[PDB]
Amino acid sequence: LTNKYYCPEVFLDAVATKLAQTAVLFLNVEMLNDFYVRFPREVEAKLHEH
Amino acid sequence: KSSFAKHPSARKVISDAAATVLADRSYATSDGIEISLKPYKFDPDIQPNE
Amino acid sequence: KSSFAKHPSARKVISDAAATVLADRSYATSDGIEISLKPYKFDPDIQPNE
Numbered sequence: 001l002t003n004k005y006y007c008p009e010v011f012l013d014a015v016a017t018k019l020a021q022t023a024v025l026f027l028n029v030e031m032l033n034d035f036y037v038r039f040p041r042e043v044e045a046k047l048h049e050h
Numbered sequence: 051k052s053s054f055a056k057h058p059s060a061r062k063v064i065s066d067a068a069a070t071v072l073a074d075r076s077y078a079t080s081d082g083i084e085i086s087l088k089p090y091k092f093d094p095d096i097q098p099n100e
Numbered sequence: 101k102s103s104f105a106k107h108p109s110a111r112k113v114i115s116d117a118a119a120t121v122l123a124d125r126s127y128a129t130s131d132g133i134e135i136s137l138k139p140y141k142f143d144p145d146i147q148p149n150e
Contacts, residue, residue, distance in 0.1 A: 001098050015094045022090060023083045029139040031079040035071055042067040050063050086136045 004011050054061040104111045 001096060004096070011096065014096045014100045018094055018096075018100065019087060019090060023087055025139045026083050026086050027079060029142050030082050031072070031075050033142070034075045035068075038071045038075075039068060042071055043064055046063050046067050047060065050060070082135055082138065085132055088132065089136075 054064060104114065
């Protein structure tokens with residue numbers, strides 16, 4: 001890992017995988033559970049009203 | 051693939067329900083993810099396993 | 101230890117300054133720390149080694 005400036009490829013890909021997982025954690029919580037819970041209700045209510 | 055292949059109005063009702071849920075929740079997820087990423091923007095320190 | 105051992109007034113001004121800056125960032129720090137804690141608020145999954 002010591003030649004970070006000599007291996008831009010490996011390093012940039014490391015930063016990409018990290019930012020991916022930590023942003024993903026939030027993502028699943030904030031957004032995915034939000035779907036699984038708001039979707040069926042919204043589906044039923046708009047179907048019924050429609 | 052569901053039984054709503056026909057009935058395109060009901061189908062459009064279900065699709066638009068999904069879309070309106072995701073589009074209502076879109077902001078908080080984005081901005082939330084940037085704020086949780088604030089520490090990793092300053093020092094994305096890389097471990098030898100990473 | 102500093103050169104302001106004498107001069108109790110200027111020392112208290114230096115301290116109080118420090119006090120107000122920290123108090124100025126305290127709220128932002130707290131709210132941001134909450135938001136980063138939102139995925140753990142729902143499901144703080146515990147691995148075995150933890």
